[PDB]
Design a protein around this ligand. Sequence first.
Ligand SMILES: [Zn+2]
Ligand SMILES: [Zn+2]
Ligand SMILES: [Zn+2]
Ligand SMILES: [Zn+2]
Ligand SMILES: [Zn+2]
Ligand SMILES: [Zn+2]
Lengths: 376, 376, 376
Amino acid sequence: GMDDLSEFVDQVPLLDHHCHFLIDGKVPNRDDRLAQVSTEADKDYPLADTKNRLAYHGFLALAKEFALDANNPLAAMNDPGYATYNHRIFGHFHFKELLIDTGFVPDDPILDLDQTAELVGIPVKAIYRLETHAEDFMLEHDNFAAWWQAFSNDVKQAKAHGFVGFKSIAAYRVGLHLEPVNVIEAAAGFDTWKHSGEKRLTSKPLIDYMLYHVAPFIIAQDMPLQFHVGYGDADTDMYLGNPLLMRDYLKAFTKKGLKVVLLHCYPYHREAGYLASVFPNLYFDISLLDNLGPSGASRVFNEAVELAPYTRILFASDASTYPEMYGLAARQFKQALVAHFNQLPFVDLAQKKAWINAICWQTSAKLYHQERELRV
Amino acid sequence: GMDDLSEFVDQVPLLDHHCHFLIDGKVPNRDDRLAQVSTEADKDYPLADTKNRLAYHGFLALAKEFALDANNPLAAMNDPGYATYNHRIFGHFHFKELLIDTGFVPDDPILDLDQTAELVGIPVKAIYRLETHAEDFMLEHDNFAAWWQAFSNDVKQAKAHGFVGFKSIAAYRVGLHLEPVNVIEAAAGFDTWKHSGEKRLTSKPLIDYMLYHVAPFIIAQDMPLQFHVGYGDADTDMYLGNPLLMRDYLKAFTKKGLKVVLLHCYPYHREAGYLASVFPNLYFDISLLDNLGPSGASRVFNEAVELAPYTRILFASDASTYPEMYGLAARQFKQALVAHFNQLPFVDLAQKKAWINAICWQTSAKLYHQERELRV
Amino acid sequence: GMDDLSEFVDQVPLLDHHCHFLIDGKVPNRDDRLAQVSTEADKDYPLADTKNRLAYHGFLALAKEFALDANNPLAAMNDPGYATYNHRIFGHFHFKELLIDTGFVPDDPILDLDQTAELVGIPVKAIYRLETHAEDFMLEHDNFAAWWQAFSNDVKQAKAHGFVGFKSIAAYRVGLHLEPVNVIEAAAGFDTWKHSGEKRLTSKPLIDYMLYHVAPFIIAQDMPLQFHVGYGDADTDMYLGNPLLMRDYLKAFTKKGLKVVLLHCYPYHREAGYLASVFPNLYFDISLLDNLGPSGASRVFNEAVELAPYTRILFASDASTYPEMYGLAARQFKQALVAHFNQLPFVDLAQKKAWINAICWQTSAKLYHQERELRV
Ligand SMILES: [Zn+2]
Ligand SMILES: [Zn+2]
Ligand SMILES: [Zn+2]
Ligand SMILES: [Zn+2]
Ligand SMILES: [Zn+2]
Ligand SMILES: [Zn+2]
């Protein structure tokens, strides 16, 4: 029937399965940095226009709500104050763990995960970004075979090195129409890349080869593989970000045990939820939409779960830089859950609570093997 | 103004213009069969995940509500009990006729239409599935010309043989980007098919040839041609299921009198409704979504009719196997109609009722020539 | 918090930045003309089906509400009555200026802009349709070079000749996947066009050449370039109307100062709003949807602004022919604004009012240099 889940959802812990480094709290232009991170627009896009989106105003609202000094709510913060401030936000929303994709580095970063864990008050683990590791290995080798040996060995060693999952940014570089590639074309892609002088990996033949060939390595370590899907920057071709384009890859590997996680998804969240309903081992979130498109979080959540199992959708923030972005994601997502489940037909209160727990922390705890961190 | 159409919609009859065979009520694993039919996932997909979708819970709710034995609500049923149970569900929702696409055969089927009509208490007629008839004729002929003569004669005889319409499953096999094909390519497709040893018709050249060439035969019999659109299984390429891809076929035949019905449509229901607004003789439904994505039925209905004429959208369940799937479709669709029409601006109560009648039974009665069965 | 903006929105002026000529009020078949303009269906589409869409009923409701003679609400009108009637509708909704794309000519038009301004009681300015000017110049020249010189000079002179912006109908002719074209291919397109005997410009190579080459001319005059996006007639390929397909053109010119306005957008309004969030100088509206899909205006507005800046979305009607179509657009859009902003989080009442003003008139006043006309 009709329930009131607000108080329950207030206390539900969050395992943020995909997010990003924070920056140094002492950085002076905090208001502008908040504005800049509130959008995927680039540095040339007018800041005044960014400030006329709702996300920025959500960030300001949270800054005011949790401010150390109500009279100087946008002040830079020294280390004790910044830790206090982070603790207030992460604690308010009951975040219990962050899994950080360490391949994105914001300006003035806090890179150390132990320092991040001290700052926010909860455990923080790393996700291995494939393409950035591929780039760094490229610089050390002049031929495909030696590069591939070194890179693939690094991928195979990720679990041993303390990573808890993997990430591909293919959608930002080449799109998601993943198809198998012969080693001839992959190696030609490598050579073209090497000779171009550009560090950035943008070769579709080489990225697609890499993704097909690392899948067994990832399955053997039994850790998830995340993909960015949808919502990107002006250099992302969003037309190629429709996750239906991944069907051949999903057919190839999900039945073999590859756990694939579709990040963000918007505007293709119905497609992602559909895919979750027909493929094994396929999970998704509405991160980035949930904080940077805050008025859409409830309707997007609802649309996202029309066909999906509730045990396949995950909480993530996709947040970087400042705790407001984490907080806003949490607030909008938790509001969406209450609005969705309060009037949901057919199921009892206990089932509603079981599904909310799954989405917020429990599915990710299982998927990423983080059960211990989520113990009460 | 603001009306309350609940009581009116409760009594409105339904002509289910596209649905599927039921199974033997004596089958022992009824709970699991209900779960399995509640999704388009295949037998290898984890049943526990399917059971964590809302559709399964809707089916269980209806099973409990209408149960023969409240203490054993999921029991298999002998023939008198099963007829009683079917009568309770079909009667509650005021189903008055089923048009069954006889080309899908669930395991342990009830294939006889007279037996089905006795079971459910209302008339049941057949829809002629093109591709399955094409397959069965293929087995009897070693060359295209003899196959085409035999198959086309069968299509021409469908009305005489008691079928009330036609169906294409092209979307599941080859997609919906229908383009004309020369007989050379069609016959080469036939030969490749014949030589492959695979019974399943998957040749795009041959399917597209077939669809262009049977259109005049169907027009001459003045019966509708249904197409699956959108929501399919993991082997369906949903990217090719966008009905905008059908525009050349629609331009070719709708003006000639071909009555085309777009089944399911989701996630392309706005596209289908748009098409209904600019092509003659083009109808659609939100079947399969309405029962298997039950939380989406109201918003999907609303989105579907933003541009469509209300006289072009139809009720269907797309239900098979068990009466719960029929009932859930009816319940969610009837709820959508009340929610939509109660507050709809500009039109009077009488117009609201006229449109509800059109959608639920009257348009399909006209389209399929079933006026007699829908008499009060 | 929760505001009540109804009274505020009632008084907000509208700058209708994209709309179309009215027709002679004396035309006898006014009811049928209202029906015919209420849809993008063509003259062969059954009028009875058009009359079973909600838009027609909205038009009738407004006709009754504002009727000169309550007893003959659908009567043709002589000139004084027609001016009175237009004044009632435009005045009720607080229209303050119309910018008319003069490249669409309805049957029995009022073509004179001064006469239109007298009829409606507000200033009326012209938008220069590229393709129709291109067609008219084609008739006067037998070779590409002389045609291009004449046409490009006309484009360069548009501001001097009193036009206030430009419009491309590329979406209706060739779609929106704009790519650069060599002069060889453009000139071959011109020759094929010239030799075909068809006046209508349909050559993709020539249209795309034209659009890339006129951009600098338009930037130099600092006036906007409008594109039809999405919702078109049965001869429009809506599949090619996805504005994500424009990304290379937007990357080429927005940073150079080209002000691009995406008209209508539906069903790709989320895509348009996304684009507004990551490109400079990129604006959009939900015109045509707002009046011809009147039940969708609120949800479409909401979806449209999930990511966009509120300072990038504009009011337009896309209305032609009769004042009811203008009025219905205004009514549905103003209702959408109240529903959206009343409960919008994070921002204060003043910010809500600032954004409403931006959308209704102020952004367009700036963009089109019409500040003087919007003075109170
Ligand atoms: Zn991402
Ligand atoms: Zn990310
Ligand atoms: Zn189907
Ligand atoms: Zn079916
Ligand atoms: Zn237009
Ligand atoms: Zn227009």
